[PDB]
Ligand binder design. Structure first.
Ligand SMILES: [Fe+3]
Ligand SMILES: [Fe+3]
Lengths: 423, 423
């Protein structure tokens, strides 16, 4: 089957491009001087944008599809969400977890997402969801490379056998070590928990992704320990701080001091715009803070930052179709990244930057890489974002794994007219 | 042609419903006890939701489709936007305005919007855009009932001949009298401008819609004058305060006092979530306020509030496809109206509440009303909102004026599977 992608636009490049495929890899990328004809074994991008696959750097596949079960959250807070989740966690079964994880994973495949990092709550002696997710990881592997992050949701030091269970999760095969220092009983447990997390990541050679300062508390500064420990161990690339919503509330002087360390450390940041706008600012009356981390500033400083969906129809977020362009849309608005170039470059926040966060080794439209790429029916990132386009084709190992025939809208004026909303 | 809409769901009602049509009107609405068969002259809603048309209570059709012309905004502020617009206004032609207005109007027809209130800048001795828009109003009338609001963008008292031009606009046929008291040189000009606006509305028997306190200034309280004058004249239904973003920044005590007047006055409020999240909070560093008016509180108090798109690809907002479900999505998130019922009832903010704001006399799925209705391929408001569904059919005077064949997404697993993102 497929030998070429033709008539492709590429972000930050002029003109049209031909992507040659061989043995499941990209063999060569060649500029075109005009439109190429279609032929058998050519997939025509039709002057749409070709990008490496969307990435979901932060989702909770063990909580997905449980919104309102057994009860709703309600106050719309992180803290009530954890309480509601704890009630649902007591009701987990193996098949329950696999079915719900797979439901969301199919939406993700449909949405051109080929790389997903799922957190899985390991504050659970039975490790029910983890055992299920390890099977799901193997099952979905033809379509999605799933990383599993062992997430000690109720604390490492603040939950019975929390450290032991976290380590057990790694011994069972979790790819990433998690932590939640702002949810530990004390600041000292918070800091200690990070030492323990880093020690485990080094013992097992695993990545780190900390739920870090997800709280509107200007004194929640666990991020400095995450970055300092990464710098000390020389392991920045392998380390991620998720959320860091407290950073929205820091004074500017501390933030400036901190940013030097953040860039030196080389650690990654995940913002979760759909969830953060909902859960943050809940303790303000009016005015009410936005509560997303300092994405615009990170980008300006060359600090790697990217966007996750976080929860899809779960205890913290009742909405979602696991759509990364939608996540991006919310983040651009709330972060005021609304300049033409900022919007256009927005795709990086859900592609390349997220690949870096996942420490991916085979990602991007480049000769020698696996032929994993998606085609958006749009002229550039700005257009894709504005029109919230579907993924026309998703290609993995040089084979089509998803396609969307786009909607067709007609208005019946003096004559019928097709409406495509371009611009 | 059409005699019936069958298999219809209706918000806040159980089961399925049949809507009988005669002579361009709804003749009767009858409950069904099961699914009805299709037949010729029946439009099958297919257990989707049937609602009266979407409404756009606040857009600027004279500025639409001009983003970046001749220059970009940039700081992303209201104030720079006005400066950029002033540069574009100097370049207006009759045909320019008509073509751009019509481009956005077609997107609106496609999006099931049958009622639109456009502001038109009348701080312009030539009244170029107004004259063009009055023609557009007549031209689009088969598909959209367009209200024209004379908008003294540069002030009534603060712009040469501002009051005369505003009155000239009414004499030429503008439906609604506008004002912009927070942009007047002084608080006293602000208050005086409102007296003059009310006097004109009473002289000409027109509606009022004030760009009111669109500024992060806790001292911008022109809304109390708008409400008090409406109450005094007994004309609440005819009066709207657009934006009121300053209200996001008021102390709670004043707001409580004010709310009594707001409910007694009976005036309408328009929030513009996509634009407000972008333009407000621009003078904060961190934390940064959201800057939308007190929508949740208004709803809790039974104060009529609704959502507009405001600007579509214009000097204040570079994005948009004139999509009301998208506007609604942003507003629910930023306003934290994220409870299941709050999300589900969200449709009211872009249907019934907006009809009230426009003082519409023939609106809603009721016997005797014009057969103006749209069909969403969704089970209820929550589902429509979550999945950002298109308008399957738009019906006006009992005739189909727009339709969307929805996207078709397939994932190629062990077997091909259709993906619809339900839930
Ligand atoms: Fe999370
Ligand atoms: Fe406006």
């Amino acid at each position: 089957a497929l030998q070429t992608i033709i008539n492709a636009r590429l972000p930050g490049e002029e003109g049209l491009w031909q992507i040659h495929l061989q043995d499941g890899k990209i063999s060569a990328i060649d500029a075109q001087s005009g439109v190429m004809p279609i032929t058998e074994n050519s997939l025509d991008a039709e002057q749409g944008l070709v990008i490496p696959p969307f990435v979901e750097p932060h989702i909770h596949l063990d909580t997905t599809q449980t919104a309102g079960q057994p009860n709703w959250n309600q106050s719309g807070t992180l803290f009530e969400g954890i309480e509601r989740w704890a009630e649902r966690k007591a009701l987990l079964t193996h098949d329950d977890v696999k079915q719900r994880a797979w439901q969301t994973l199919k939406w993700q495949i449909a949405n051109g997402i080929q790389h997903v990092r799922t957190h899985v709550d390991v504050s659970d002696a039975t490790l029910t969801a983890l055992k299920a997710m390890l099977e799901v990881k193997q099952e979905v592997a033809p379509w999605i490379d799933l990383q599993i992050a062992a997430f000690p949701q109720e604390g490492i030091l603040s939950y019975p056998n929390g450290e032991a269970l976290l380590e057990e999760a790694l011994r069972l095969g979790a790819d990433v070590v998690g932590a939640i220092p702002h949810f530990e009983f004390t600041r000292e447990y918070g800091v200690e928990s990070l030492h323990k997390t880093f020690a485990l990541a080094q013992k097992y050679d695993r990545l780190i992704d900390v739920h870090c300062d997800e709280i509107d508390d200007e004194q929640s500064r666990f991020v400095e320990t995450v970055a300092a420990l990464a710098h000390h161990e020389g392991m920045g690339a392998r380390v991620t701080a998720s959320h860091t919503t407290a950073m929205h509330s820091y004074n500017g002087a501390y933030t400036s001091r901190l940013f030097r360390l953040l860039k030196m450390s080389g650690i990654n940041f995940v913002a979760n715009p759909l969830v953060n706008i909902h859960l943050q600012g809940r303790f303000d009356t009016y005015p009410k803070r936005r509560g997303i981390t300092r994405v615009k500033e990170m980008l300006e400083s060359g600090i790697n930052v990217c966007f996750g969906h976080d929860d899809v129809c779960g205890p913290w977020y009742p909405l979602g179709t696991a759509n990364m362009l939608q996540v991006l849309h919310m983040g651009l608005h709330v972060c005021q990244l609304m300049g033409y170039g900022q919007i256009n470059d927005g795709l990086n926040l859900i592609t390349h930057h997220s690949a870096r966060t996942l420490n991916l080794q085979d990602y991007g439209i480049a000769a020698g890489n696996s032929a994993n790429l998606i085609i958006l029916p749009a002229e550039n990132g700005f257009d894709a974002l504005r029109r919230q386009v579907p993924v026309r084709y998703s290609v993995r190992g040089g084979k089509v794994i998803a396609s969307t025939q786009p909607a067709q809208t007609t208005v019946y004026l003096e004559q019928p007219e097709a409406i495509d909303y371009k611009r």
